[PDB]
Every structure is written in structure tokens, then in C-alpha cells.
């Protein structure tokens, strides 16, 4: 059972055609458009004439961007990642020529130029080709293309069929062909057709060539959960789309392909959020990194000059050619998330030390700096930035600013400053404020020459300290805000606080500074939109309480669903039916919706009779799978829902002076089975 990008079962597949000028009654056509890629593509093609040759992959399909090309010509297949300048209508060259010294001279009519080629791959030709007949597509070829983490992955299958205009039903398992390390951003694609009749095009500008009714199918992959069945050889022989219908959802909570007669509580394989949301406040102003990082003088390490950074946008991109950072270490936050976060408070803490002491600006360090000068705390939650600055802090005579402390009677506490400049008697004799035997002035000046080892060269350190409170945000990242879809089970990110649920207008009242509210369980249940100040509450995307009633997969495939504690009119709103597959909405609305005391039962025909209970639904209702041959003519079996009976109703003829006395007996022998032991194990 895996979550990955799969082609959903019974999903929409677009059907494209070609000219068939020799079969369309003297009528042609040219249509192989450019299609999106969309996280992966499923391509199928029933063909007989070997007109499909390959594909193009890329984004702009120009020389200003690299692209990928696949051409199976006859012997060997050619895969190139060069910089192609494709034509507006690309196709392959020659078709054939009989004894004219021009047999199979295939010239590329695809691109005007190819340059800066990075990848080149040649191997044996795909499934089959060079067939020529009609009225039968003797070969169905399927392909799945993926492009993840730099690799281009192709999976294919080749099966023999004979149909006319149908993508034949059935199960399909494609095997891996190639994983190519091409590493290119791919957004669009297009198909290569072989259209030629002794020449590529007509005499001057028309097709007027061989067009053998090219037709292919295109489907797109979606993030889904599948249950695959591997055989002895490791070949996938069966699968279940957990998000297809209530029966598949049941075969996924019970990881099995067969289900017994009963009622089953079910996990949520149903909805998937499709779009995300960013709602950041109006800051529109960049932080003063040009004056914080790039200043004439920095503070001394012992006088380290904390300053704060209020409303501004934190975009570290501006310093990419401005400065090079030798140290950039973040605590309590990851460096790749600094763009998606908003902070309520920020501080700076700039100073200058030597290059060998930059390691002492970590939380649990010891040393001259970490003991007497700076002392970061234990729960820091910030980033530490450092960079060599010998070009501004070193002078040819020496730079004797930037003092530092060397003698202190006790270690500094976290974030404590000290400028005491007293005399520090080291022995036991009194000091009298005079530098003498065991009395040293405690501050000493660094000496920063340009002819120094990289361990004695000056380094500028900046220690950003931020917090994440329920206050309004002051510093935000460079994320760009999107719109506000507020009904449709989206991913959201408001002030760096992410999540996934259903947004909805709320009636809760927040304090003026509050940005979100929690529940008894520490889960965000309401958030304030920082762009409209509106409070709106969050609802989980998953609806629990769905039980699926089945008569057994080896008996039938129709089921009934029970939505526990849901009004029958609010079922499509509770399960988000509009976001479900069409085979799910069959069980949200219905011809036969029955409102039990437990919940809404959709899929079973409520009868007025009563029987002994077969499958217990609850609250007095049971359900069974009964035929209707006596209920209707040529009627098939279905699922009925009735109120179970407690037995035959009876009455006793009681009176003052009447007794019933038996005249005959009936010796009966009944059995009783009792387990006495169980298997003992060690």
C-alpha cells in the first residue's frame, strides 16, 4: 500500500486523431498539439501503420531552453537532450522509396538547429514497428513518463489486440524502460508523427502525404494511494484505487482484494487537497540588510550592540554577490523554511572576533569568547551568520579597535553584557586599582594586520534571534500571497502557520492581538486572515464515521454506505462530494436515501417488512442482500434495509380458573460447545 503519483481508475482520457487523408474521403487534417505535462503523463496508442515515432519534452520548446527528444526510427532509438529550435509543426522525414537509391533516408524535419547538447542516449527500438495493414490495431503501446529529482523515467507495455476505435478495458502493468539523468524542468510535451509519401510534405506547402489515421490517448497522473499485488516474479498483477468508490476504500483499510459479508468502519482515502494558500500581511518593504551587514564599523565583542528588526521583509537573496558567508547555522528552524515563515520579534547582535573563535558562537561552547564575552543561551532559536572581513577590518599598520575581555571572575550568563573595565586582582593581594603583579587590565585590543593567517583575521558575526508567538507578525519572508479559497479543503499557510483543512467564515471573537485559536487538543481550530483581519475557523478535511455494507466480493460488488450521525440532506456537504470522484457522488445523493437513528443509509432500499437480522447496521436496523425475482419481473438481487424483528408476537389466554396441562412429551437432545484450551506458545 503506497502513496505516489498514479493514473486514477476510470479517469478522463483525451482522444486525439489525425488526417487519414486516404480514408477521410479526400479530406486531411493536421493536429498534434502541445499538451501540458502536469506531474506525469499516461500515453497510449493503438496503431498499425507505425506512424507514432516519439515525443518532445521541454518548457518553451525554443533555443533559449534545453529540451528532450525521442525518435525511434527503425534500428536503434535516439534520445538527445540538446537545445533544439523546434518547428511549429514537427514531424519525421522520409517514409519509403522503392529502388530509387533513396531507401530510408530519414532527415529531421523537427528542429532548425540543435546546440549545447548535454545528454545523448541510443538503444534498441521500442516495442514494434514497420507494420502495414488496416482494419486492425494489432499493437497497443502504453507509456508513463515521470520527471522527479532530475531523472526522466519511462515505463511501457506492449500488448496485442484487434479493435477499431476503442481503448480496450482491462488491467495494465507497465515495466520500467529507462531512468535517464537529464535534469531539466519539463512543463509541456508534443508527439512526433511520421507523415511522408515519397517526401515529407506536398510539392509546395501542404501535407498531401501518407496519413494513416494516427490516434492516441493522453491521461495525467494524480497523487493517490494504491494497493498493489506483487506476484512471485515481482510483477504487479492487480491493484486497487483506494479513492475510487466505497468498495475500494474498504479493500484498502483491510489490505486485501476480497471482502467478506459484513459492515466495515473505514479510513479516509477519499479527499485530497488540490490547491495551496499563502496569506501574508502587507509588508512590501525589504529589511535593512544593506546597513546591518555592510557598515563602516562593528561593535566590539564585549560591547556587542543588540538591535531589533521590526516591520520589513527578510529576503537574504540580496546579499548573494554582496557578501560571502563562511558560517550560516540555524537553530530551531531550517534554512529552507526561512522563506515561508513570519516572525513576531527579531534581534541582531553584531560584533567582530577572530576567525578561530567563530566556532565559539554556538549554544554550548566554552572559551575566551563564550565565557567572558558573548555566551549564547541553551534554547536559542535563531541563526548565526559569520563572514571574513579582512578587507575592511584590517589596516596595513594594524587595526587596534575591537577590544575583548580576557579576565573575569565568573562566566557570563546568556545574552549578558559586561563593560566593567575594573582591574581584576588575580592573586589574593588587594589590587588598589593599579596594574601590578597580579592585576591586569581586563580588556585587550585585537591586532588585525593584512598579513595574518586566516585564523587571526577579523570576522563579522551576526546573531539573529527570533520568536514565534501569538502576536502579529513583524518580519515576513518573501512568499507571495495567493487568493483565499474558503470552502474546498485546501492547504494553507497564514503567518508561517501551515496546515490542511476546510476554511470557513467563523463567528468566534479574537483579542486584538490574537492570530489563532486552539482546542482542548492543541490543534489550531481558527485563524485570523492578516490581510482582511477576518477570523475564520478550520475544519478537518476527513470525515469519520463512514461504514460500508457489502454482501461479499465473491457474491456481488454493489454496496451501501452509512454516514454516522449525519442528516441525509447534509451528506454531500459533510463528505465534500464535489471534490470526490463521480463514482462517489453516487452514494451522496441517491434515489434511496434512508435516515436511520444512527445516520444516513444510502444505497439500500428500505422495505416495510421485518426479518431476522443478517448484517447489523445499528439502532434497530439490519440489512441483507435479497433477490427480487418474486418482487419484480426479471429483477436482480439488491440490498434491502429493514427493522429487525424480535420474534413472533403471541398472547396467553389467562383467566381465573383455566389451566393448560400437557398430554404428551418430546424428548430432545441439544448440543453445547465450550472451548476448554488454546494453543500454548513460547
Amino acid at each position: 500500500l503506497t502513496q505516489d503519483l498514479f493514473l486514477p481508475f476510470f479517469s478522463n482520457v483525451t482522444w486525439f486523431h489525425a488526417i487519414h487523408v486516404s480514408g477521410t474521403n479526400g479530406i486531411k487534417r493536421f493536429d498534434n498539439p502541445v499538451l501540458p505535462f502536469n506531474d506525469g503523463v499516461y500515453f497510449a496508442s493503438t496503431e498499425k501503420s507505425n506512424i507514432i515515432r516519439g515525443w518532445i519534452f521541454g518548457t518553451t520548446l525554443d533555443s533559449k531552453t534545453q529540451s528532450l527528444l525521442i525518435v525511434n526510427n527503425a534500428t536503434n532509438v535516439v534520445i538527445k537532450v540538446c537545445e533544439f529550435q523546434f518547428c511549429n509543426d514537427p514531424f519525421l522525414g522520409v517514409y519509403y522509396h522503392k529502388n530509387n537509391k533513396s531507401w530510408m533516408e530519414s532527415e529531421f524535419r523537427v528542429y532548425s538547429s540543435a546546440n549545447n547538447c548535454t545528454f545523448e542516449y541510443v538503444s534498441q527500438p521500442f516495442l514494434m514497428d514497420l507494420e502495414g495493414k488496416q482494419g486492425n490495431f494489432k499493437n497497443l503501446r502504453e507509456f508513463v513518463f515521470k520527471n522527479i529529482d532530475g531523472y526522466f523515467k519511462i515505463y511501457s507495455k506492449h500488448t496485442p489486440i484487434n479493435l477499431v476505435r476503442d481503448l480496450p478495458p482491462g488491467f495494465s502493468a507497465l515495466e520500467p524502460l529507462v531512468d535517464l539523468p537529464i535534469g531539466i524542468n519539463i512543463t509541456r510535451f508534443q508527439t512526433l508523427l511520421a507523415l511522408h509519401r515519397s517526401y515529407l510534405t506536398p510539392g509546395d506547402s501542404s501535407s498531401g502525404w501518407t496519413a494513416g489515421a494516427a490516434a492516441y490517448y493522453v491521461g495525467y497522473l494524480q497523487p493517490r494511494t494504491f494497493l498493489l499485488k506483487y506476484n512471485e516474479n515481482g510483477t504487479i498483477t492487480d491493484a486497487v484505487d483506494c479513492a475510487l468508490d466505497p468498495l475500494s476504500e474498504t479493500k484498502c483499510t483491510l489490505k486485501s482484494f476480497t471482502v467478506e459479508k459484513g459492515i466495515y468502519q473505514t479510513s479516509n482515502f477519499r479527499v485530497q487537497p488540490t490547491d495551496s494558500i499563502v496569506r501574508f500581511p502587507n509588508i512590501t518593504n525589504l529589511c535593512p540588510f544593506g546597513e546591518v551587514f555592510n557598515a563602516t564599523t562593528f561593535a566590539s565583542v564585549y560591547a556587542w550592540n543588540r538591535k531589533r528588526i521590526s516591520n520589513c521583509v527578510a529576503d537574504y537573496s540580496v546579499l548573494y554577490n554582496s557578501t560571502s558567508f563562511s558560517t550560516f547555522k540555524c537553530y530551531g528552524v531550517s534554512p529552507t523554511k526561512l522563506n515561508d515563515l513570519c516572525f513576531t520579534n527579531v534581534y541582531a547582535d553584531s560584533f567582530v572576533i577572530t576567525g578561530d573563535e567563530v566556532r565559539q558562537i554556538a549554544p554550548g561552547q566554552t572559551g575566551k569568547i563564550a565565557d567572558y564575552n558573548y555566551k549564547l543561551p541553551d534554547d536559542f532559536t535563531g541563526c548565526v551568520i559569520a563572514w571574513n572581513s579582512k578587507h575592511i577590518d584590517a589596516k596595513e599598520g594594524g587595526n587596534f579597535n575591537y577590544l575583548y575581555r580576557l579576565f573575569r571572575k565568573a562566566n557570563l550568563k546568556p545574552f549578558e553584557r559586561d563593560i566593567s573595565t575594573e582591574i581584576y586582582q588575580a592573586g589574593s593581594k588587594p589590587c588598589n586599582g593599579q596594574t601590578g603583579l597580579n592585576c591586569y587590565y581586563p580588556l585587550y585590543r585585537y591586532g588585525f594586520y593584512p598579513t595574518d593567517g586566516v585564523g587571526h583575521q577579523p570576522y563579522r558575526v551576526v546573531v539573529l534571534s527570533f520568536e514565534l508567538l501569538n502576536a502579529p507578525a513583524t518580519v515576513c519572508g518573501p512568499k507571495k500571497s495567493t487568493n483565499l479559497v474558503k470552502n474546498k479543503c485546501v492547504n494553507f499557510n497564514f503567518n508561517g502557520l501551515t496546515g490542511t483543512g476546510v476554511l470557513t467564515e467563523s463567528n468566534k471573537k479574537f483579542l486584538p492581538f490574537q492570530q489563532f485559536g486552539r482546542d482542548i487538543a492543541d490543534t489550531t481550530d481558527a485563524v485570523r486572515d492578516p490581510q482582511t483581519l477576518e477570523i475564520l475557523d478550520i475544519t478537518p478535511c476527513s470525515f469519520g464515521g463512514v461504514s460500508v455494507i457489502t454482501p461479499g466480493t465473491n457474491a456481488s460488488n454493489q454496496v451501501a454506505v452509512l454516514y454516522q450521525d449525519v442528516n441525509c440532506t447534509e451528506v454531500p456537504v459533510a463528505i465534500h462530494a464535489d471534490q470526490l470522484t463521480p463514482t462517489w457522488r453516487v452514494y451522496s445523493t441517491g434515489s434511496n436515501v434512508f435516515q436511520t437513528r444512527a445516520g444516513c443509509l444510502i444505497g439500500a432500499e428500505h422495505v416495510n417488512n421485518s426479518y431476522e437480522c443478517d448484517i447489523p447496521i445499528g439502532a434497530g436496523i439490519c440489512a441483507s442482500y435479497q433477490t427480487q425475482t418474486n418482487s419484480r419481473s426479471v429483477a436482480s438481487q439488491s440490498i434491502i434495509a429493514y427493522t429487525m424483528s424480535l420474534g413472533a408476537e403471541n398472547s396467553v389466554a389467562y383467566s381465573n380458573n383455566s389451566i393448560a396441562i400437557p398430554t404428551n412429551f418430546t424428548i430432545s437432545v441439544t448440543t453445547e460447545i465450550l472451548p476448554v484450551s488454546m494453543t500454548k506458545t513460547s
Binding site: 389451566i659 400437557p662 441439544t670 453445547e672 465450550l674
Partner: protein, 158 residues
């Protein structure tokens, strides 16, 4: 883990497997203890049912069978036992007219092992579980007090 990582780093991954496998074993043992209790209860019930249905005849209702218990036979089964309960089950249920304490000779007459059924204009006495009527004699009956019983019909009591 032991092929790719060195002992210092492999110990971190192994300690996770050790913890989870110990928890898997703990869960198994707890479930086994619970089921062993549930089956010891049934084994005690079966040890009671044997000594009270096979080595005797129980007056407890619905304990050995359904009707009035007569006898029982044990049969061994895999990890269990089967009891064949033989009961009585009276079944013909014919109505009669009855009354207590027939009043004869100025004194009440109650039956011992009887209910005082009545034919058409004729009165008899029967045991409760089987229609077998006798004549109301001095040994089918005992006498106590005057005729104040709430019905007390009149009869002969020969």
C-alpha cells in the same frame, strides 16, 4: 543497517528496531494473557457443567439444555468439549378448568402433587407435567381449616 553504518551510527538505528520489536512482543503477550483469562472462564464453566449435568441432574433452569434436564453426555472436540443435553419438553398443552381447595363436608381439601382439574361436571387430580387424572381420594388430598379459600368449589372427595 549493519552493512552500511558503523557501530556508533548503527546503534542508533538498531535501538529503534529493538524498541519496536520488544513492543510487538509485549503486545502479543498482553493479548495472550487476556485471551487466556477469557478461556479459563469457559473452562471453569465446562468443568462445572460436567460435574452438574453428567455426574448429576441439575435443577438449574437452562443450565443443562433447554427443557427439564434429564441427563447429559460429553464428547471431546479439538480444544473444547461438546455436551449432548437430554431434556423433557412437554408438548400437547390441552386446556382444562381448575380451582383450588374443593370444599367438601365443611372443610377445605388441597391436593398433594396435583392441581384439581375438571372434566365435564367431573373433577379429578393430576400431576403438573403430564395429564394423568385420578379420583379425589383421602390420600390424593390433605385437609386444613374451613372453606375460606377464594374459590373453593364444592365436591365429593371420596
Amino acid at each position: 543497517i549493519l552493512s552500511r553504518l558503523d557501530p556508533p551510527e548503527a546503534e542508533v538505528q538498531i535501538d529503534r528496531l529493538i524498541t519496536g520489536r520488544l513492543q510487538s512482543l509485549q503486545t502479543y503477550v498482553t493479548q495472550q494473557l487476556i485471551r487466556a483469562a477469557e478461556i479459563r472462564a469457559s473452562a471453569n464453566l465446562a468443568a462445572t457443567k460436567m460435574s452438574e449435568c453428567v455426574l448429576g441432574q441439575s435443577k438449574r433452569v437452562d443450565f443443562c439444555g433447554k427443557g427439564y434436564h434429564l441427563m447429559s453426555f460429553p464428547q471431546s472436540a479439538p480444544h473444547g468439549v461438546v455436551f449432548l443435553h437430554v431434556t423433557y419438553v412437554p408438548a400437547q398443552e390441552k386446556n382444562f378448568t381448575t380451582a383450588p381447595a374443593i370444599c367438601h363436608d365443611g372443610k377445605a381439601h388441597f391436593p398433594r402433587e396435583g392441581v384439581f382439574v375438571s372434566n365435564g361436571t367431573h373433577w379429578f387430580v393430576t400431576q403438573r407435567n403430564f395429564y394423568e387424572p385420578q379420583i379425589i381420594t383421602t390420600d390424593n388430598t390433605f385437609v386444613s381449616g374451613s372453606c375460606d379459600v377464594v374459590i373453593g368449589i364444592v365436591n365429593n372427595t371420596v
